[PDB]
Amino acid sequence: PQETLNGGITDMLTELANFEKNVSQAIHKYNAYRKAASVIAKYPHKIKSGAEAKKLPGVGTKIAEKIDEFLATGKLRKLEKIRQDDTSSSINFLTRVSGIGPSAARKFVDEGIKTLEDLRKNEDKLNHHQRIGLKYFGDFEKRIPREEMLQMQDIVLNEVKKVDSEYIATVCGSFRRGAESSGDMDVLLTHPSFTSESQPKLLHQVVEQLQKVHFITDTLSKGETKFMGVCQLPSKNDEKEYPHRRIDIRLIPKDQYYCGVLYFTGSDIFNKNMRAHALEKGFTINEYTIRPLGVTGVAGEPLPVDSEKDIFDYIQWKYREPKDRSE
DNA sequence: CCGACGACGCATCAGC
DNA sequence: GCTGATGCG
DNA sequence: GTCGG
Ligand code: NA
Ligand code: NA
């Protein structure tokens, strides 16, 4: 549905969501508003009243009332007020820095630190993650065109294979589903020597190599199984440099790899459905394993999984291409 | 009425 | 110093 | 804030 249909309503609900998360620290209200915004955004009719919207799942009495106020007046008094509230709008803004969450944003604003300029003047008050989030503030808010994601994938797969040709690497997320753009890069990594029953350095050796070839530029966090950092494609001598991009790399045991690839490929709606179907078939699926459920509901040992298809076969579902996992 | 609403890796804090 | 809690994503 | 046991 065109954004002109209910974009006013959905924009209002998304703004209310952000204030719940970042200012009121009410995460379940943030998700309530997002859920409302999503079901309205997919509604293929320009809404005429709150009662109409309340028929939708996730829209209740309070949001119906707000929609009535918005349709009648073109705005929402409470949103107008918080928008111009210097403290609340500054707290909400600062959480756009990666590493600054609601608690840090509140603490900063409490001591007069309200803008990117104020953060730049107060480096010693920022931790390592927050300094990187500030350094790449604008780059991190840009989307990644699919052509750049392919070039990024070219580098990851080549360097991974270079370290050890027995590594297996898969770039998941919307990109694997075919998306024309991405917000970041999610790489899932495994190695036949790493199973749930049985090296460190498996992840470090890959991160190191990507740093040696100057693809990974910064690290946000790094442990034995999860890396979160920054990468950047090489710029042709003489062309504008590519923005810096967020990349995550996860090391997963081989016997849990394809469960992980399935989960992190998504979509979220699709996983909810598959997990719903799996239950009504006698199986429980999480990001790690698929396990059978006994007649009293006791989950048994995880079942062998050697491919994505294996998971579909267990639950009597035809294999769906990532391209067809929108829901 | 009133609890669920995602679990978890990593960085860093709070407490001992 | 070690252990658990909290923040963040 | 919404849903539902
Ligand atoms: Na409803
Ligand atoms: Na943030």
mmCIF file of C-alpha atoms (C1' of nucleotides) and ligand atoms in Angstrom:
data_model
loop_
_atom_site.group_PDB
_atom_site.id
_atom_site.type_symbol
_atom_site.label_atom_id
_atom_site.label_comp_id
_atom_site.label_asym_id
_atom_site.label_seq_id
_atom_site.Cartn_x
_atom_site.Cartn_y
_atom_site.Cartn_z
ATOM 1 C CA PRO A 1 0.000 0.000 0.000
ATOM 2 C CA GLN A 2 1.262 3.480 -0.921
ATOM 3 C CA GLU A 3 2.658 5.473 1.988
ATOM 4 C CA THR A 4 0.079 8.148 1.096
ATOM 5 C CA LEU A 5 -2.659 5.762 2.333
ATOM 6 C CA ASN A 6 -1.983 5.846 6.092
ATOM 7 C CA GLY A 7 1.532 7.295 6.266
ATOM 8 C CA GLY A 8 0.385 10.017 8.634
ATOM 9 C CA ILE A 9 -1.014 7.420 11.026
ATOM 10 C CA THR A 10 1.949 5.072 10.739
ATOM 11 C CA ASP A 11 4.502 7.900 11.070
ATOM 12 C CA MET A 12 2.726 9.087 14.236
ATOM 13 C CA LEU A 13 2.729 5.578 15.709
ATOM 14 C CA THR A 14 6.428 5.081 14.909
ATOM 15 C CA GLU A 15 7.298 8.415 16.554
ATOM 16 C CA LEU A 16 5.297 7.435 19.662
ATOM 17 C CA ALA A 17 7.103 4.101 19.641
ATOM 18 C CA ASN A 18 10.513 5.766 19.698
ATOM 19 C CA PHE A 19 9.612 7.987 22.633
ATOM 20 C CA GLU A 20 8.354 4.948 24.576
ATOM 21 C CA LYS A 21 11.627 3.135 23.970
ATOM 22 C CA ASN A 22 14.131 5.961 24.332
ATOM 23 C CA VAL A 23 12.460 8.352 26.783
ATOM 24 C CA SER A 24 9.915 6.422 28.824
ATOM 25 C CA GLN A 25 12.048 3.225 28.772
ATOM 26 C CA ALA A 26 8.876 1.193 28.099
ATOM 27 C CA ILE A 27 10.060 -1.418 25.621
ATOM 28 C CA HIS A 28 6.761 -3.312 25.441
ATOM 29 C CA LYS A 29 4.940 -0.089 24.601
ATOM 30 C CA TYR A 30 7.558 0.590 21.907
ATOM 31 C CA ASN A 31 6.758 -2.806 20.406
ATOM 32 C CA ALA A 32 2.985 -2.300 20.839
ATOM 33 C CA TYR A 33 3.183 0.854 18.720
ATOM 34 C CA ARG A 34 5.440 -0.787 16.139
ATOM 35 C CA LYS A 35 3.038 -3.730 15.872
ATOM 36 C CA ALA A 36 0.156 -1.275 15.379
ATOM 37 C CA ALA A 37 2.180 0.665 12.811
ATOM 38 C CA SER A 38 3.001 -2.494 10.869
ATOM 39 C CA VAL A 39 -0.535 -3.858 10.591
ATOM 40 C CA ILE A 40 -1.833 -0.441 9.542
ATOM 41 C CA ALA A 41 1.001 -0.043 7.021
ATOM 42 C CA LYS A 42 -0.110 -3.274 5.305
ATOM 43 C CA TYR A 43 -3.818 -2.280 5.378
ATOM 44 C CA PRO A 44 -4.859 -1.574 1.757
ATOM 45 C CA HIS A 45 -7.450 1.091 2.520
ATOM 46 C CA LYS A 46 -7.135 4.684 3.660
ATOM 47 C CA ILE A 47 -8.490 4.499 7.213
ATOM 48 C CA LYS A 48 -11.536 6.643 8.004
ATOM 49 C CA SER A 49 -11.892 6.194 11.769
ATOM 50 C CA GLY A 50 -10.315 4.697 14.843
ATOM 51 C CA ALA A 51 -13.078 2.100 15.027
ATOM 52 C CA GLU A 52 -12.055 0.897 11.561
ATOM 53 C CA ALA A 53 -8.433 0.475 12.656
ATOM 54 C CA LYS A 54 -9.362 -1.161 15.963
ATOM 55 C CA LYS A 55 -10.575 -4.166 13.962
ATOM 56 C CA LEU A 56 -6.930 -4.833 13.190
ATOM 57 C CA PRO A 57 -4.874 -7.052 15.512
ATOM 58 C CA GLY A 58 -2.556 -4.885 17.575
ATOM 59 C CA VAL A 59 -4.743 -1.760 17.442
ATOM 60 C CA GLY A 60 -6.635 -1.199 20.687
ATOM 61 C CA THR A 61 -8.777 1.441 22.354
ATOM 62 C CA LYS A 62 -5.985 3.943 22.994
ATOM 63 C CA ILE A 63 -4.516 3.883 19.500
ATOM 64 C CA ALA A 64 -8.005 4.057 17.987
ATOM 65 C CA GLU A 65 -8.569 7.239 20.023
ATOM 66 C CA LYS A 66 -5.273 8.691 18.834
ATOM 67 C CA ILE A 67 -6.166 7.911 15.218
ATOM 68 C CA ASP A 68 -9.483 9.711 15.729
ATOM 69 C CA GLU A 69 -7.603 12.773 17.040
ATOM 70 C CA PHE A 70 -5.183 12.634 14.104
ATOM 71 C CA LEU A 71 -7.919 12.299 11.470
ATOM 72 C CA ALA A 72 -9.938 15.165 12.952
ATOM 73 C CA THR A 73 -7.085 17.627 13.543
ATOM 74 C CA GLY A 74 -4.083 16.456 11.526
ATOM 75 C CA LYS A 75 -1.935 16.053 14.617
ATOM 76 C CA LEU A 76 -1.640 14.601 18.162
ATOM 77 C CA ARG A 77 -1.362 17.092 21.067
ATOM 78 C CA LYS A 78 0.829 14.733 23.107
ATOM 79 C CA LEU A 79 3.211 14.146 20.202
ATOM 80 C CA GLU A 80 3.332 17.854 19.371
ATOM 81 C CA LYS A 81 4.266 18.548 22.988
ATOM 82 C CA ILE A 82 6.997 15.948 23.398
ATOM 83 C CA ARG A 83 8.493 16.910 19.984
ATOM 84 C CA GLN A 84 9.332 20.383 21.284
ATOM 85 C CA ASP A 85 10.400 19.227 24.722
ATOM 86 C CA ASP A 86 14.132 19.906 24.677
ATOM 87 C CA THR A 87 15.098 17.145 27.114
ATOM 88 C CA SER A 88 12.898 14.437 25.674
ATOM 89 C CA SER A 89 13.756 15.206 22.053
ATOM 90 C CA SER A 90 17.475 15.283 22.910
ATOM 91 C CA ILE A 91 17.320 11.929 24.705
ATOM 92 C CA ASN A 92 15.437 10.437 21.767
ATOM 93 C CA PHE A 93 17.950 11.896 19.289
ATOM 94 C CA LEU A 94 21.101 10.700 21.064
ATOM 95 C CA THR A 95 19.973 7.070 20.924
ATOM 96 C CA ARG A 96 20.597 7.271 17.181
ATOM 97 C CA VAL A 97 24.261 6.820 18.099
ATOM 98 C CA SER A 98 25.163 3.144 18.036
ATOM 99 C CA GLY A 99 26.113 2.225 21.589
ATOM 100 C CA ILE A 100 23.976 5.002 23.161
ATOM 101 C CA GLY A 101 20.771 3.454 24.448
ATOM 102 C CA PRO A 102 18.010 4.999 26.555
ATOM 103 C CA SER A 103 20.049 4.838 29.751
ATOM 104 C CA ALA A 104 23.164 6.494 28.301
ATOM 105 C CA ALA A 105 21.097 9.083 26.409
ATOM 106 C CA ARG A 106 19.313 10.021 29.667
ATOM 107 C CA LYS A 107 22.610 10.274 31.546
ATOM 108 C CA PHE A 108 24.152 12.474 28.862
ATOM 109 C CA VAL A 109 21.158 14.807 28.692
ATOM 110 C CA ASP A 110 21.071 15.058 32.497
ATOM 111 C CA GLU A 111 24.542 16.644 32.427
ATOM 112 C CA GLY A 112 23.914 18.991 29.489
ATOM 113 C CA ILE A 113 25.190 16.752 26.673
ATOM 114 C CA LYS A 114 22.393 16.970 24.082
ATOM 115 C CA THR A 115 23.851 17.061 20.545
ATOM 116 C CA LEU A 116 26.473 15.333 18.398
ATOM 117 C CA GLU A 117 28.541 18.455 18.878
ATOM 118 C CA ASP A 118 28.370 17.960 22.651
ATOM 119 C CA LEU A 119 29.397 14.316 22.292
ATOM 120 C CA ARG A 120 32.358 15.329 20.128
ATOM 121 C CA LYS A 121 33.501 17.709 22.881
ATOM 122 C CA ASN A 122 33.169 14.965 25.552
ATOM 123 C CA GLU A 123 35.065 11.979 24.132
ATOM 124 C CA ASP A 124 36.312 10.754 27.485
ATOM 125 C CA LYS A 125 32.713 10.242 28.632
ATOM 126 C CA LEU A 126 32.022 7.808 25.743
ATOM 127 C CA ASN A 127 32.976 4.146 25.751
ATOM 128 C CA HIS A 128 34.670 2.490 22.749
ATOM 129 C CA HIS A 129 31.418 1.440 21.085
ATOM 130 C CA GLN A 130 29.902 4.908 21.494
ATOM 131 C CA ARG A 131 32.989 6.586 20.033
ATOM 132 C CA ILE A 132 32.694 4.423 16.927
ATOM 133 C CA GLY A 133 28.956 5.009 16.666
ATOM 134 C CA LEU A 134 29.636 8.752 16.783
ATOM 135 C CA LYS A 135 32.477 8.561 14.274
ATOM 136 C CA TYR A 136 30.228 6.838 11.738
ATOM 137 C CA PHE A 137 26.921 8.426 12.737
ATOM 138 C CA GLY A 138 25.810 9.291 9.206
ATOM 139 C CA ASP A 139 27.296 6.257 7.462
ATOM 140 C CA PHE A 140 25.513 3.892 9.850
ATOM 141 C CA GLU A 141 22.148 5.417 8.946
ATOM 142 C CA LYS A 142 22.650 4.823 5.200
ATOM 143 C CA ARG A 143 21.275 1.741 3.536
ATOM 144 C CA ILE A 144 23.548 -0.591 1.567
ATOM 145 C CA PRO A 145 22.653 -1.159 -2.104
ATOM 146 C CA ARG A 146 22.580 -4.799 -3.144
ATOM 147 C CA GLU A 147 25.444 -4.282 -5.620
ATOM 148 C CA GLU A 148 27.638 -3.185 -2.707
ATOM 149 C CA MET A 149 26.483 -6.124 -0.614
ATOM 150 C CA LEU A 150 27.595 -8.486 -3.399
ATOM 151 C CA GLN A 151 31.005 -6.780 -3.507
ATOM 152 C CA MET A 152 31.165 -7.073 0.270
ATOM 153 C CA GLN A 153 30.202 -10.767 0.071
ATOM 154 C CA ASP A 154 32.864 -11.358 -2.599
ATOM 155 C CA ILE A 155 35.484 -10.177 -0.097
ATOM 156 C CA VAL A 156 34.142 -12.114 2.893
ATOM 157 C CA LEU A 157 33.846 -15.439 1.089
ATOM 158 C CA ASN A 158 37.252 -15.106 -0.587
ATOM 159 C CA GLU A 159 39.142 -14.191 2.587
ATOM 160 C CA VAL A 160 37.323 -16.834 4.655
ATOM 161 C CA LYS A 161 38.258 -19.556 2.136
ATOM 162 C CA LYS A 162 41.813 -18.160 2.115
ATOM 163 C CA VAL A 163 42.188 -18.686 5.870
ATOM 164 C CA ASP A 164 40.828 -22.255 5.671
ATOM 165 C CA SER A 165 39.006 -23.722 2.650
ATOM 166 C CA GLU A 166 36.942 -25.860 5.059
ATOM 167 C CA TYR A 167 35.160 -22.864 6.594
ATOM 168 C CA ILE A 168 31.544 -22.403 5.535
ATOM 169 C CA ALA A 169 30.256 -18.845 5.361
ATOM 170 C CA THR A 170 26.759 -17.596 4.561
ATOM 171 C CA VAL A 171 25.582 -13.946 4.382
ATOM 172 C CA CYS A 172 21.988 -14.113 5.721
ATOM 173 C CA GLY A 173 19.389 -11.382 6.439
ATOM 174 C CA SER A 174 17.081 -9.769 3.837
ATOM 175 C CA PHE A 175 20.063 -9.839 1.455
ATOM 176 C CA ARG A 176 19.892 -13.633 1.234
ATOM 177 C CA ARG A 177 16.130 -13.309 0.575
ATOM 178 C CA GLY A 178 16.978 -11.094 -2.411
ATOM 179 C CA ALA A 179 16.499 -7.613 -0.973
ATOM 180 C CA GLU A 180 17.535 -4.660 -3.140
ATOM 181 C CA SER A 181 19.222 -3.039 -0.130
ATOM 182 C CA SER A 182 20.388 -3.887 3.368
ATOM 183 C CA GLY A 183 20.939 -2.076 6.628
ATOM 184 C CA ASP A 184 24.020 -4.135 7.551
ATOM 185 C CA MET A 185 25.863 -7.418 6.819
ATOM 186 C CA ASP A 186 25.203 -10.595 8.867
ATOM 187 C CA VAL A 187 27.720 -13.409 8.201
ATOM 188 C CA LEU A 188 27.206 -16.861 9.724
ATOM 189 C CA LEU A 189 30.357 -18.952 9.969
ATOM 190 C CA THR A 190 31.119 -22.585 10.815
ATOM 191 C CA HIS A 191 33.915 -25.140 10.447
ATOM 192 C CA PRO A 192 33.696 -28.959 10.577
ATOM 193 C CA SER A 193 36.040 -28.960 13.589
ATOM 194 C CA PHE A 194 33.504 -26.973 15.662
ATOM 195 C CA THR A 195 30.485 -28.924 16.953
ATOM 196 C CA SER A 196 28.309 -28.533 20.055
ATOM 197 C CA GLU A 197 30.350 -31.255 21.801
ATOM 198 C CA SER A 198 33.675 -30.119 20.315
ATOM 199 C CA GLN A 199 38.843 -24.172 18.693
ATOM 200 C CA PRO A 200 39.086 -20.661 19.733
ATOM 201 C CA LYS A 201 40.843 -18.640 17.028
ATOM 202 C CA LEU A 202 38.271 -20.025 14.531
ATOM 203 C CA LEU A 203 36.475 -16.670 14.626
ATOM 204 C CA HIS A 204 39.648 -14.629 15.388
ATOM 205 C CA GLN A 205 41.512 -15.999 12.379
ATOM 206 C CA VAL A 206 38.727 -14.818 10.075
ATOM 207 C CA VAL A 207 38.421 -11.407 11.725
ATOM 208 C CA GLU A 208 42.225 -10.997 11.602
ATOM 209 C CA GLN A 209 42.386 -11.776 7.900
ATOM 210 C CA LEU A 210 39.589 -9.336 7.103
ATOM 211 C CA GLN A 211 41.519 -6.735 9.101
ATOM 212 C CA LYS A 212 44.794 -7.533 7.293
ATOM 213 C CA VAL A 213 43.240 -6.806 3.882
ATOM 214 C CA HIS A 214 41.776 -3.598 5.363
ATOM 215 C CA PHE A 215 38.123 -4.601 4.955
ATOM 216 C CA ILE A 216 37.285 -4.567 8.669
ATOM 217 C CA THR A 217 38.173 -1.104 9.993
ATOM 218 C CA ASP A 218 36.871 -1.092 13.600
ATOM 219 C CA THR A 219 35.660 -3.496 16.268
ATOM 220 C CA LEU A 220 32.588 -2.900 18.449
ATOM 221 C CA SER A 221 32.764 -6.215 20.331
ATOM 222 C CA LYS A 222 34.579 -9.477 19.753
ATOM 223 C CA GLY A 223 34.523 -12.775 21.571
ATOM 224 C CA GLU A 224 35.007 -16.430 20.747
ATOM 225 C CA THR A 225 31.648 -16.738 18.929
ATOM 226 C CA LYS A 226 30.388 -13.265 18.005
ATOM 227 C CA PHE A 227 32.034 -10.321 16.291
ATOM 228 C CA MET A 228 30.374 -6.937 15.727
ATOM 229 C CA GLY A 229 32.259 -4.246 13.867
ATOM 230 C CA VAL A 230 32.734 -1.958 10.909
ATOM 231 C CA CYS A 231 33.829 -2.605 7.337
ATOM 232 C CA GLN A 232 34.333 -0.591 4.171
ATOM 233 C CA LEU A 233 34.718 -1.502 0.514
ATOM 234 C CA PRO A 234 37.943 -0.334 -1.161
ATOM 235 C CA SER A 235 37.513 2.898 -3.186
ATOM 236 C CA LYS A 236 38.921 3.109 -6.700
ATOM 237 C CA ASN A 237 41.928 5.391 -6.763
ATOM 238 C CA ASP A 238 39.994 8.616 -7.631
ATOM 239 C CA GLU A 239 36.446 7.853 -6.704
ATOM 240 C CA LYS A 240 34.303 8.900 -3.675
ATOM 241 C CA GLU A 241 34.957 6.489 -0.794
ATOM 242 C CA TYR A 242 32.216 4.080 0.210
ATOM 243 C CA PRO A 243 30.562 4.719 3.579
ATOM 244 C CA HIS A 244 31.511 2.538 6.496
ATOM 245 C CA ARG A 245 29.134 -0.371 7.123
ATOM 246 C CA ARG A 246 28.094 -2.460 10.103
ATOM 247 C CA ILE A 247 29.060 -6.120 9.862
ATOM 248 C CA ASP A 248 28.407 -8.931 12.354
ATOM 249 C CA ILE A 249 30.110 -12.319 12.179
ATOM 250 C CA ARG A 250 28.856 -15.276 14.225
ATOM 251 C CA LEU A 251 30.577 -18.621 14.695
ATOM 252 C CA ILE A 252 28.047 -21.443 15.071
ATOM 253 C CA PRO A 253 28.630 -25.158 15.766
ATOM 254 C CA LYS A 254 28.288 -27.244 12.570
ATOM 255 C CA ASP A 255 25.435 -29.301 13.998
ATOM 256 C CA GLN A 256 23.526 -26.018 14.637
ATOM 257 C CA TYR A 257 24.586 -24.099 11.511
ATOM 258 C CA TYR A 258 21.595 -24.621 9.244
ATOM 259 C CA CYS A 259 19.152 -23.905 12.074
ATOM 260 C CA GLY A 260 21.072 -20.632 12.469
ATOM 261 C CA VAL A 261 21.033 -19.877 8.720
ATOM 262 C CA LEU A 262 17.280 -20.503 8.646
ATOM 263 C CA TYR A 263 16.625 -18.231 11.662
ATOM 264 C CA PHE A 264 18.877 -15.343 10.631
ATOM 265 C CA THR A 265 17.616 -15.484 6.999
ATOM 266 C CA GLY A 266 14.031 -14.902 8.173
ATOM 267 C CA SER A 267 11.829 -13.049 7.652
ATOM 268 C CA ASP A 268 10.600 -12.602 11.237
ATOM 269 C CA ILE A 269 7.009 -13.236 10.153
ATOM 270 C CA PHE A 270 8.134 -16.305 8.232
ATOM 271 C CA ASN A 271 9.955 -17.772 11.243
ATOM 272 C CA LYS A 272 6.916 -17.213 13.466
ATOM 273 C CA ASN A 273 4.832 -19.145 10.930
ATOM 274 C CA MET A 274 7.344 -21.988 10.524
ATOM 275 C CA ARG A 275 7.702 -22.297 14.284
ATOM 276 C CA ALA A 276 3.901 -22.255 14.609
ATOM 277 C CA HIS A 277 3.577 -25.019 12.009
ATOM 278 C CA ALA A 278 6.406 -27.003 13.590
ATOM 279 C CA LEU A 279 4.591 -27.093 16.941
ATOM 280 C CA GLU A 280 1.314 -28.307 15.425
ATOM 281 C CA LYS A 281 3.507 -31.020 13.857
ATOM 282 C CA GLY A 282 5.158 -32.114 17.117
ATOM 283 C CA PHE A 283 8.496 -30.248 16.841
ATOM 284 C CA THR A 284 10.051 -27.235 18.574
ATOM 285 C CA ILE A 285 12.323 -25.004 16.452
ATOM 286 C CA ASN A 286 14.593 -22.301 17.844
ATOM 287 C CA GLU A 287 17.670 -20.623 16.370
ATOM 288 C CA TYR A 288 19.911 -23.584 17.386
ATOM 289 C CA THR A 289 17.982 -26.854 17.025
ATOM 290 C CA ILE A 290 14.789 -28.621 16.021
ATOM 291 C CA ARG A 291 13.606 -31.143 18.636
ATOM 292 C CA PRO A 292 10.637 -33.527 18.877
ATOM 293 C CA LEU A 293 7.940 -32.963 21.484
ATOM 294 C CA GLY A 294 6.602 -36.009 23.317
ATOM 295 C CA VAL A 295 2.952 -36.588 24.049
ATOM 296 C CA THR A 296 3.171 -34.755 27.415
ATOM 297 C CA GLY A 297 5.155 -31.865 25.881
ATOM 298 C CA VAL A 298 8.678 -32.959 26.920
ATOM 299 C CA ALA A 299 11.215 -31.970 24.265
ATOM 300 C CA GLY A 300 13.595 -34.733 23.214
ATOM 301 C CA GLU A 301 17.159 -34.513 21.998
ATOM 302 C CA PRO A 302 17.913 -32.235 19.021
ATOM 303 C CA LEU A 303 17.499 -33.947 15.611
ATOM 304 C CA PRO A 304 20.296 -34.146 13.024
ATOM 305 C CA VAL A 305 20.265 -31.200 10.613
ATOM 306 C CA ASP A 306 22.631 -31.176 7.623
ATOM 307 C CA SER A 307 20.845 -28.578 5.469
ATOM 308 C CA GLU A 308 18.027 -26.051 5.515
ATOM 309 C CA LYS A 309 15.833 -28.561 3.648
ATOM 310 C CA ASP A 310 16.316 -31.102 6.462
ATOM 311 C CA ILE A 311 14.354 -28.733 8.751
ATOM 312 C CA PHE A 312 11.526 -28.418 6.206
ATOM 313 C CA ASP A 313 11.445 -32.215 5.793
ATOM 314 C CA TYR A 314 11.041 -32.838 9.536
ATOM 315 C CA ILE A 315 7.953 -30.608 9.667
ATOM 316 C CA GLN A 316 6.438 -31.852 6.348
ATOM 317 C CA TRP A 317 6.907 -28.546 4.545
ATOM 318 C CA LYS A 318 8.146 -28.153 0.957
ATOM 319 C CA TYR A 319 11.456 -26.277 0.888
ATOM 320 C CA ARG A 320 10.867 -22.567 0.342
ATOM 321 C CA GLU A 321 13.609 -20.532 -1.334
ATOM 322 C CA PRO A 322 14.840 -17.584 0.770
ATOM 323 C CA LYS A 323 13.278 -15.403 -1.951
ATOM 324 C CA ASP A 324 9.867 -16.757 -0.899
ATOM 325 C CA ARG A 325 10.249 -16.308 2.890
ATOM 326 C CA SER A 326 8.617 -12.879 3.115
ATOM 327 C CA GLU A 327 6.081 -14.557 5.432
ATOM 328 C "C1'" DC B 1 -7.526 -8.631 36.392
ATOM 329 C "C1'" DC B 2 -3.024 -8.961 35.370
ATOM 330 C "C1'" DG B 3 1.346 -11.256 33.250
ATOM 331 C "C1'" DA B 4 3.618 -11.852 28.681
ATOM 332 C "C1'" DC B 5 5.491 -9.364 25.316
ATOM 333 C "C1'" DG B 6 12.894 -13.065 22.787
ATOM 334 C "C1'" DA B 7 17.003 -15.219 24.352
ATOM 335 C "C1'" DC B 8 21.646 -14.239 24.621
ATOM 336 C "C1'" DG B 9 26.968 -12.573 23.553
ATOM 337 C "C1'" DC B 10 29.812 -9.096 24.881
ATOM 338 C "C1'" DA B 11 31.409 -4.779 27.381
ATOM 339 C "C1'" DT B 12 31.204 -2.640 31.499
ATOM 340 C "C1'" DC B 13 29.377 -1.586 35.976
ATOM 341 C "C1'" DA B 14 28.094 -2.658 40.910
ATOM 342 C "C1'" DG B 15 29.037 -5.218 44.707
ATOM 343 C "C1'" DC B 16 31.799 -8.120 47.476
ATOM 344 C "C1'" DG C 1 40.596 -9.836 41.998
ATOM 345 C "C1'" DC C 2 35.922 -12.621 41.057
ATOM 346 C "C1'" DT C 3 30.787 -12.941 40.175
ATOM 347 C "C1'" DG C 4 26.498 -11.373 38.864
ATOM 348 C "C1'" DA C 5 23.652 -7.364 36.933
ATOM 349 C "C1'" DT C 6 22.731 -4.183 33.587
ATOM 350 C "C1'" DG C 7 22.975 -1.962 29.004
ATOM 351 C "C1'" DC C 8 23.026 -2.562 24.296
ATOM 352 C "C1'" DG C 9 22.009 -4.520 20.226
ATOM 353 C "C1'" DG D 1 -0.502 -0.602 24.751
ATOM 354 C "C1'" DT D 2 -2.622 -4.825 23.403
ATOM 355 C "C1'" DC D 3 -3.864 -9.374 23.960
ATOM 356 C "C1'" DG D 4 -5.684 -13.203 26.176
ATOM 357 C "C1'" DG D 5 -5.771 -16.830 29.967
HETATM 358 NA NA NA E 1 -7.709 -4.527 17.497
HETATM 359 NA NA NA E 2 21.729 3.681 20.074
#
